[PDB]
A paper describes a structure:
To further advance our understanding of GUS structure and function we also determined the crystal structure of NL BdGUS. Like the L1 GUS structures, BdGUS shares a similar core fold with EcGUS, with 3.1 Å root-mean-square deviation (rmsd) over 528 Cα positions. Unlike the L1 GUS enzymes, BdGUS is a dimer and possesses two additional domains at its C-terminus. Sequence analysis revealed that first C-terminal domain of BdGUS is a “domain of unknown function” (DUF). The tertiary and quaternary structure in BdGUS is highly similar to that exhibited by BuGUS, with a 2.3 Å root-mean-square deviation over 816 Cα positions. While BdGUS does not possess a loop at the active site, as predicted by sequence analysis, it does contain a loop insert in the CBM that enters the active site and is not present in BuGUS. BdGUS and BuGUS share highly similar tertiary and quaternary structures, but the catalytic efficiency of BdGUS was nearly 10-fold less than that of BuGUS. Given that the main structural difference between these two enzymes is the presence of a CBM loop insert in BdGUS, the CBM loop may explain this difference in activity, as it may occlude a substrate like pNPG from being properly positioned in the active site. Finally, despite its lack of an active site loop, the NL BdGUS was found to be weakly inhibited at pH 7.5 by UNC10201652, with a predicted IC50 value of >25 µM. However, the CBM loop in BdGUS may enter into the BdGUS active site and provide stabilizing contacts, enabling slight inhibition.
Residue numbers in the entry:
A (entry chain D), B (entry chain A): 20 to 879
Write the structure that this text describes.
């Protein structure tokens, strides 16, 4: 059997404890009653998406009784770690073997003469995660937590004693560049390092075959040299004999095999045999576009985060190719590995499937004027490059992102990062990402020095979202080129958050409907495809991802994703597919909005509905009557659908293609005369006057509020809340951003009427379960803003609730009785006689009243 | 204002602790460090679906600072408890007020004398869950779990002191019967008691109205009577001929409304007004069928359990109507409320939608020979009936389900419970359900009285599932009439478990595919639709429900539902819709199977596919080509669909109806160098030779296993496990049934190869990851059987995995190094050189080996 085994996984049956005692490195310690976890693992997989603010930053320990197979006797035994969050202290049989810094790169551990091969050993890992590490290790801050743990795999490796120097940086056994390649003939110059950890000397043959994708050999190149024991000998060959090469592209992803056999001269033994995929391509950059192999190429894609729903970042490794395949089939050709490098699998995926890669490290938000800090940033960039190097998919090396002070050590550290990128990797480009707050540094600063470092400049534009409107967005793309005027631009991040529960026919900023997310990404794609100088752009983000602290619709989540945290495709995903993929498609938008309840007194509820597509034309049939053929423009065709009570079958057609979508639509008359709905429950989203919220647990649709008209329902006084004084949001963001405790229905409780003293519904006689949904929406410190929060001089809010003349909640104070921003529900049973219907009163004692929702059920 | 409140919820912000200290009732206790919950609350929502066998049966305490609005001052004030699992012990202001036995019925506590309107009061509930209670109170045992907590709502309510007596069973305030009902006229009898709790004497009119659905008074009648304090005055009036009443059916569930007021004849002040809906119907039973309102009605339905996924039985109250709507929309007219009485709103839902109700109390599995057990059943029969007295939907009252020993005191209690049903309410029918294990008591008792007590005899048949097969189904229904000779019969349970992840073209018993659950019910329907002496039949169950202990494909869940545990529809919910619902429909089987990957070398892969429908004909169009119009026989038309590789589109059409369903198929060659599975990874469910398994988290598809042929893969040795000694499953069921700790992929692990020693896989060259998925499949008790288990006579199983000569796992003891029935995943990186492919040896040092899974990925 000429085939050999190289590593065995060791991710199984570990003992974990959240406590910090230096005794836990002891062979002879008693870990019996520690929890038993399998790897990957992270102690913040739940900590972050909790209702408690903040997650535990600290130290924990992992112990493993680690056996070593006998086939690794007499060999050089190593331990590879693909990913440990922040600092790691690997102890073996009591004795500290290595320490590592950096949460995102792999690292090695030589255990050869320390371990007993055959017997059994104790492997102890102190894993640190503290906030304190920020004064010496990036990332320093940012919009992404760091789940602590050992969250990528761990393996036990062994090779022969004549071996390849990979340390201190877990670099790839042998680097391979392509210095000059074009449509004619190819060049490949390999770099490596053999070392003889034997007792004697050995004299080698070092063979280098380059085999087809069909593995028919195209070249040979055999060398020989003398390795004396302990000498670290440098190899640096080069071949250029390669005829009529098959070139790698994001469309045609052709990879080559470059075998390397190191074999004993007088003996015939094979000591090593690296094999590594390689790609032939070429590219460059300027304000005239991005070019690859000659032709023109616009880079189109997104950034990916390395976490999954409720798993922390201890993802199954198969996840990594699954995330990237969902990007490729979205129609992209580019991915932005941010804000940190990721699993070997990510990179392997993007050059087997074809995806140009942008790869940063986590110098995020700020630098620390600190001797030590800068050193680790370069030690980490040194690891990113040499660990992922023969990967043709990769094109740009990043390191900085969204700084807020390009100070002195900053700009110097900026230069040192570039010098060492093209030093290490001369045949790849470099990149950086600024934010787009031009009222802050580096735009308020003395100079413009920094925009003239890296080969491409990225910008993070969120106009129409965090501030600015529909109109300020092309002006924002403009004045960036004011600065990055030497080198070409790139759209780093852009995206709006969305929730598959909030829908609106008139979407506005920061209501989190997939509707607004659609218009956002359709204004941005139009501005970006027109300008070729911006060589590319990236959606932020491919995924929804979990960051502890973040609020809004799904609290402790970033919702700008194109996939949910569990990788279900949102409808923005299909829109992009229609503007990018060459693989024919059609899709009726609204698959996430299949049940609808809407006030309408006519027979017909006409509502626009759009069909995303690749083709030139789309036909749409409503209930069997075609609505006409229409041309697809910017991926989209918008029909006007005459919706009617009951089932609505919309079937879209265009050529050989199809999509179907059944929309259940319940027309509700404004007079409560004509409605079965009260027997089910009339659920009213108080303070929300332009969105429908659907709770997927009950399928309850929370219809929007309206002012009271005679014979119907609504409020009498009061206004829905939307004051954000001093932002683009004032009068546009309805409701607060708070996470609300004891409810999942955030879009319901966050919306509220303020100052409403009276609510009417004109219902028929009978018994009613009225249920009220309250929360104090404001924190103790924002309640110090007495006008905006409608509270008393001392910040209190006591009011009473009366129904039909009876005081029934006698002094409701939400904050001091239930906690601020905690959900409070009270149900009442009221018998309505005469034809009085329901008159609800909120009598303020201190401050002004608040209600988030109402539910009206006729129970008999 | 003539309107008034009655009740107000007190389910918000409670204090909770799982300790038992009697001081916990004291007003001044410091519950400051206790956790806050809102009701509905259980405390086994987690317990029941975790890995630890069992759940926590014990005592916990609730505390709530109870505020009493002044609107209720010097009125009669009651606490309302809709449900509290087993024993409650309610204290107010330190003083114990009520103790209550029984999880499933409501009780009431009077606080008018003890409470304090305007002060804070302290309301302590001690709640109790111990099996220790099963000796004095049912249920004793049974396929479900008693989720301790206060899991239904709780109300504080107030009346005026002249009030309808409700205690001791918290009955409906006026009882209502219809002794005579026909198309031309109906009679009506109302029953109530009155009490005066003032100091004065009061003279009161009683005003009885009977209003139609438009609330037009169709009958009225007043009664004069005077009430000296404290005396319990009965009343019982009749209402004369009602004339041409609108009857109640599951088709037309017309509902009237008995309005009963009690006013003061001297001034006119109104003391009470009680609104009570009713319907007019009449029914009977014989061996020729069920008759409702004069016509023959085949009763077709399903039972419903109380719980919802991850919420235990602390469901929100609206879920109750959501379930009943889903059920009516499956074509049911019948619901089996079992094994316990359920929420008030299940019964309000059922008689508004149109579903006839069989309603049981919870005397399951055995009757206890104690004087106190029997008494508590009587009092739980009283509580059920008196609380659900007026619901037109209830037609049958139950008490016992599946006894296993009809001993003397059992028959004595079947008798007093029928004697009691007819006493308290003579106008409804009576029912009971038996098991179908003819080899056990009571089918082997000398006597047969137990089969002659209550008016209808149900039977729970699982032939073809727990025992038997296709040949024994109909012979069983006949045997049940051998015993049910006087009273008619009913099919109260029948079902088969299904998993949405396991799919088979050749379904067999206990593989948990929906395609066997399909055939099962087909065979069952067809028999009932021709057996008129089975007046009706109810599927088991409407929902997957949560029960600790049960394992199989999804552990801790009873998987026999029409809907998933979160109320999503399975394939078979649509099959019932074909056979029952009178709403025209069409639907292609396989919406749970759109990703398929099969071994097939020709370009076309013919597979059979069903289309469910109401209609006489379906035409099916695959990829634009029509496959013809097939007649719909007994709900379905199967076709032979010629699947190609790639996207396949299926159009089913019937006049105006149509369903559409795309199916993605990956064809896989036998020879491994013909495709690219290896580059994502070949996932092979070893031990499973007829079901595919879609891991919904990675969307990977564990294909079945085939013995080895050359050029491809498969096992050289051994055999997949399927040994069930003495059972009908013997050879039929592959795998074991135990919960496999540490995974959610129980269909992958529970199946496995046994006694295999060699495994081949003729893959190209390159570097491979190979995962190994293991488990000790049997327990210590189960390994006492050396022969079925394949272990050493001391009970042990040790072996070494080796690949391509080299030994890597050094000697594995599964149940000793990691625990029995835990999941372990090893991963080698091995370098296939030359043309060796992959040899995998399992070498046993004790017993025979086992192995569940294989992933084979080509990484470079
Ligand atoms: Na609201
Ligand atoms: Na298996």
């Amino acid at each position: 059997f000429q085939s050999n085994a190289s590593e065995i996984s060791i991710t199984d049956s570990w003992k974990y404890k959240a406590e910090n005692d230096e005794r836990f490195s002891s062979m002879d310690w008693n870990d019996s009653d520690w929890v038993t976890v399998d790897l990957p693992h992270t102690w913040n997989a739940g900590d972050v998406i909790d209702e408690q603010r903040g997650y535990r930053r600290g130290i924990s320990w992992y112990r493993k009784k680690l056996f070593i197979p006998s086939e690794a006797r007499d060999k050089k035994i190593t331990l590879r770690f693909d990913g440990v969050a922040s600092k790691a202290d690997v102890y073996l049989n009591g004795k500290l073997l290595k320490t590592h810094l950096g949460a995102y790169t792999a690292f090695g551990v030589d255990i050869t003469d320390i371990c007993e091969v055959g017997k059994e050993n104790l492997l102890a890992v102190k894993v640190d995660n503290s906030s304190s590490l920020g004064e010496i290790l990036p990332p320093v801050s940012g919009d992404f937590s760091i789940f602590g743990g050992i969250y990528r795999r761990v393996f036990l490796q062994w090779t022969e004693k004549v071996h390849f120097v990979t340390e201190p940086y877990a670099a790839v056994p042998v680097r391979i560049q392509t210095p000059e390649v074009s449509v004619s003939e190819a060049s490949m110059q390999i770099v490596a390092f053999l070392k003889n950890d034997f007792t004697d000397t050995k004299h080698v043959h070092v063979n280098v075959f380059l085999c087809d994708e069909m593995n028919r050999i195209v070249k040979e190149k055999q060398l020989k040299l003398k390795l004396i024991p302990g000498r670290k000998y440098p190899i640096s060959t080069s071949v250029g004999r390669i005829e009529n090469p098959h070139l790698w592209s994001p469309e045609l992803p052709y990879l080559y095999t470059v075998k390397v056999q190191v074999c004993d001269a007088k003996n015939g033994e094979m000591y090593q045999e690296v094999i590594s995929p390689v790609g032939f391509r070429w590219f460059s950059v300027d304000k005239t576009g991005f070019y690859l192999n000659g032709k023109y190429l616009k880079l189109r894609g997104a950034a990916r985060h390395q976490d999954y729903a409720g798993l922390g970042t201890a993802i199954p490794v198969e996840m990594n190719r699954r995330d990237m395949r969902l990007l490729k089939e979205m129609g992209a050709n580019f991915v932005r590995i941010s804000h940190y490098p990721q699993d070997p699998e990510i990179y392997r995926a993007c050059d087997e499937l074809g995806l140009i890669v942008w790869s940063e490290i986590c110098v995020v938000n700020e630098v620390r004027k600190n001797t030590a800090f800068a050193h680790n940033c370069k030690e980490m960039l040194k690891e990113m490059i040499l660990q992922n190097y023969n990967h043709p998919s990769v094109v740009l090396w990043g390191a900085m992102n969204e700084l807020w002070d390009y100070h002195k050590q900053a700009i110097a550290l900026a230069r040192e990062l570039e010098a060492l990128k093209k030093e290490l990797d001369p045949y790849r480009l470099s990149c950086v990402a600024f934010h787009a707050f031009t009222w802050e540094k580096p735009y308020t600063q003395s100079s413009k020095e920094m925009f003239s470092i890296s080969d491409v400049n990225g910008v993070n534009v969120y106009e129409s979202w965090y501030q600015g409107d529909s109109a300020t967005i092309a002006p924002m793309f403009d004045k960036f080129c004011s600065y990055s005027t030497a080198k070409p631009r790139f759209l780093s991040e852009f995206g709006a958050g969305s929730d598959e529960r909030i829908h609106s026919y008139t979407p506005r900023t920061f209501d989190f409907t997939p509707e607004f997310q659609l218009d956002f990404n359709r204004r941005y794609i139009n501005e970006m495809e027109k300008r070729p100088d911006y060589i590319g752009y990236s959606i932020w983000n491919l995924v929804d991802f979990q960051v502890d602290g973040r609020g809004d619709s799904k609290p402790n989540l970033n919702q700008k994703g194109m996939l949910t945290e569990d990788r279900r495709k949102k409808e923005i995903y299909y829109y992009c597919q229609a503007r990018w993929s060459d693989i024919p498609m059609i899709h009726i938008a609204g698959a996430d909005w299949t049940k609808r309840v809407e006030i309408c007194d006519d027979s017909i509820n006409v509502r626009k509905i759009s069909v995303f597509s690749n083709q030139k034309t789309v036909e749409l049939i409503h209930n069997g009557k075609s609505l006409g053929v229409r041309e697809v423009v910017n991926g989209e065709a918008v029909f006007a659908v005459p919706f009617i009570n009951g089932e609505n079958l919309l079937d879209a057609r265009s050529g050989a293609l199809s999509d179907r979508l059944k929309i259940q639509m319940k027309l509700l008359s404004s007079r409560l005369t004509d409605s079965d709905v009260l027997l089910d429950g009339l659920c009213i989203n108080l303070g929300q006057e332009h969105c429908y919220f659907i709770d997927p647990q009950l399928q309850e649709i929370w219809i929007p509020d309206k002012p009271y008209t005679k014979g119907s329902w609504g409020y009498m006084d009061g206004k829905p809340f939307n004051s954000w004084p001093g932002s683009s949001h004032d009068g546009v963001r309805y409701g607060v951003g708070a996470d609300i405790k004891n409810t999942f229905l955030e879009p319901l409780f966050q919306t509220f009427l303020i100052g409403t003293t009276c609510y009417r519904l004109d219902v028929p006689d009978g018994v009613y379960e009225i249920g009220f949904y309250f929360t104090e929406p404001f924190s103790k410190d924002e309640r110090k803003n007495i006008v905006r929060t409608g509270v008393s001089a001392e910040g209190q809010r006591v009011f009473d609730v009366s129904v039909n003349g009876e005081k029934l909640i006698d002094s409701l104070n939400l904050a001091d009785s239930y906690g601020e921003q905690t959900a409070v529900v009270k149900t009442l049973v009221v018998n309505v006689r005469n034809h009085e219907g329901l008159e609800i009163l909120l009598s303020p004692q201190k401050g002004q009243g608040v209600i988030s929702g109402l539910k009206v059920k006729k129970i008999r």
